[PDB]
Design a binder for this molecule. Structure first.
Ligand SMILES: [Zn+2]
Ligand SMILES: [Zn+2]
Lengths: 48, 131, 97, 116
């Protein structure tokens, strides 16, 4: 599960940066990473 | 010297030593510790860099994992398993990874604006583990 | 050089030595028996019976070379024995190996 | 008798058979190369319906040094005349109907095998 969630996080940051650079501005990785992937994903898998 | 016919007793001392050194659930703890020791680092390292007009590398490495905490309107404090059990909390600890952001554009100018201990998420921790 | 979990399987009929180190290989510990006699001698039993007072533990036995973890895939190529004394003294030649 | 594959000399491939209509003889050609060679075995294909295979040709000397294989002394070797020896069944699938043993001598440098 960790591999898949990490890939999801990578895809999220990819699209985030893409959207930001399209305007020519620099993106902030702080907002690019979403915490609701790893923690939420693990909670869901172990609970359901 | 060999142990003839006085061996029923000597047979159970070795069993007692084994069950003392390694618990009943030792396999679970070992598996989880090995995960937290190597698997996470392996997964975060083997993932390829990311690139995207001017582009950038944005490479990851050097994870860190701290002890469980509640308020990582409250200050950080170590959450005990009974506390989490009694308050319906997720007994987990934060996970950090050191990230090196490098963007290169025309004019031969890039900067390794790395960020230390960028919080990623929370990983649940098994009771009576190495962490 | 080789941790205790690794397992070496010797395939006699077809010359193949297959060694496995990945995780999950369910295994268990057994005593070693060189010719017809165990390596677990009174010395080991004594040192172990005084455990919990000095420091002696299972790891000492594993290091000394008296016990050994065999995994199921290796268990198929070992002439196991049930109890030391009973199955080794001297009788009709069953396996004696 | 059997037939074993013979590969080409230049292209090193499977050589098919060919009946020389002119000289009325048997030749082996190459699909790709034009290599020819006069055959000598005068056979092409043989089928063994009974599949009479000698298990001794499959047994190997190394089986002797097996810790999970029975040992007897009542069947000493022939060449070396040693006493210890091992025995086992065909251990081969498709065993038609037989538990005839195959004794193998237990000693280095002998590797002798026989059946009784
Ligand atoms: Zn040819
Ligand atoms: Zn012989």
């Amino acid at each position: 599960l960790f591999r898949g969630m990490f890939k999801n996080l990578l895809k999220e940051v990819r699209i985030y940066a893409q959207k930001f650079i399209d305007r020519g501005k620099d993106f902030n990785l702080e907002l690019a990473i979403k915490t609701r992937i790893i923690s939420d994903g693990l909670k869901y898998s172990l609970a359901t | 010297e060999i142990t003839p016919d006085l061996w029923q007793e000597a047979c159970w001392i070795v069993i007692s030593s084994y069950f003392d050194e390694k618990g009943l659930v030792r396999q679970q703890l070992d598996s989880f510790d090995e995960f937290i020791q190597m698997s996470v680092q392996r997964i975060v390292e083997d993932a390829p860099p990311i690139d995207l007009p001017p582009r950038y590398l944005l490479k990851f490495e050097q994870i860190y994992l701290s002890k469980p905490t509640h308020w990582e309107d409250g200050a950080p404090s170590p959450m005990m398993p009974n506390e989490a059990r009694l308050r319906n909390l997720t007994y987990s600890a934060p996970l950090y990874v050191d990230i090196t952001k490098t963007v290169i554009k025309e004019g031969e100018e890039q900067l390794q604006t790395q960020h230390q201990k960028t919080f990623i998420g929370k990983i649940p921790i098994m009771l009576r583990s190495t962490y | 050089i080789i941790v205790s979990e690794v397992s070496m399987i010797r395939d006699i009929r077809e010359r193949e030595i297959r060694i496995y180190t990945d995780a999950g290989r369910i295994c268990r510990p057994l005593l070693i028996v060189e010719k017809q006699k165990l390596l677990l001698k009174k010395r080991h039993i004594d040192q172990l019976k005084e455990r919990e007072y000095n420091n002696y533990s299972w790891q000492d036995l594993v290091a000394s070379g008296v016990v050994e973890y065999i995994d199921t895939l290796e268990e198929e190529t070992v002439m196991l024995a049930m109890t030391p004394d009973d199955l080794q003294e001297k009788e009709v030649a069953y396996c004696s190996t | 008798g059997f037939v074993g594959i013979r590969f080409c000399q230049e292209c090193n491939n499977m050589l098919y058979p060919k009946e020389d209509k002119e000289n009325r003889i048997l030749l082996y050609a190459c699909r790709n190369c034009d290599y020819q060679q006069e055959a000598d075995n005068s056979c092409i294909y043989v089928n063994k319906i009974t599949h009479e295979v000698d298990e001794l040709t499959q047994i190997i000397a190394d089986v002797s040094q097996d810790p999970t294989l029975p040992r007897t002394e009542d069947h000493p070797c022939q060449k070396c005349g040693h006493k210890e020896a091992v025995f086992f069944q065909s251990h081969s699938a498709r065993a038609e109907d037989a538990m005839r043993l195959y004794y193998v001598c237990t000693a280095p440098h002998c590797g002798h095998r026989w059946t009784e």
